């Protein structure tokens, strides 16, 4: 595919166009974002290593 304007190439820019279906939006309505809107803050256990001057946090 090629397009020309003013004897110069006209290039298509922006995002990738998809084939929007009725189902693609109403599955997110079926989902509703059913994650109970409750601010659950999870902790980080500090872990000490050779230097000790600098700190290092782990996930569990």
């Amino acid at each position: 595919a090629a397009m020309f304007s003013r004897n110069k190439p006209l290039y298509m820019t922006g995002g990738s166009v998809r084939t929007i279906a009725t189902g693609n939006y109403r599955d997110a309505a079926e989902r509703l974002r059913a994650m109970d809107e409750t601010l659950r803050l999870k902790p980080f256990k500090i872990t000490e290593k050779l230097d000790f001057r600098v700190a290092a946090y782990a996930i569990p």
Partner: protein, 50 residues
Amino acid sequence: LFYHSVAMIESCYVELGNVARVSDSDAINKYTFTELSVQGRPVMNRGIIV
């Protein structure tokens, strides 16, 4: 409330002590310690969330 207040500021200022002593080149660092912990949808990570 006086006892609940000192309990909260003592908990925060102790942890900000040993958060200031981590290098920026790390997973959980100075800038990105709030985002990974929070599992909700607040407007902006400020105030009581931090």
